[PDB]
Amino acid sequence: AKAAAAAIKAIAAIIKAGGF
Amino acid sequence: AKAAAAAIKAIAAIIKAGGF
Amino acid sequence: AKAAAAAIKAIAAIIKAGGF
Amino acid sequence: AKAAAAAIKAIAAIIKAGGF
């Protein structure tokens, strides 16, 4: 999870666009 | 769920590096 | 994305609790 | 990201079930 900010900050923003 | 490749590519490829 | 509502609806709520 | 191992150790396996 050292990588987690980098992974998640894409997906939660893409989520807000997608409407999952 | 139209977004559910595109969002996931932006984590699963980073997971591959991170080792979450 | 058969799995999407099972992945996302956990993880975005877990995010809401975490602060990733 | 304190939540992130316990999030994604589900979600990566749910991805491996889905095929996202």
Side-chain angles (χ1 to χ4, degrees):
Chain A
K2 298 176 185 177
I8 307 275
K9 282 180 74 181
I11 193 175
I14 299 156
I15 284 182
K16 171 67 80 176
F20 293 80
Chain B
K2 290 185 171 182
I8 304 287
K9 283 177 180 221
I11 182 168
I14 296 64
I15 288 181
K16 170 71 99 175
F20 287 69
Chain C
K2 294 170 182 181
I8 310 284
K9 290 178 67 180
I11 230 297
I14 293 159
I15 289 174
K16 170 62 221 177
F20 281 64
Chain D
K2 290 160 61 183
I8 281 163
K9 287 176 179 280
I11 268 72
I14 291 161
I15 289 179
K16 171 64 68 75
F20 288 82

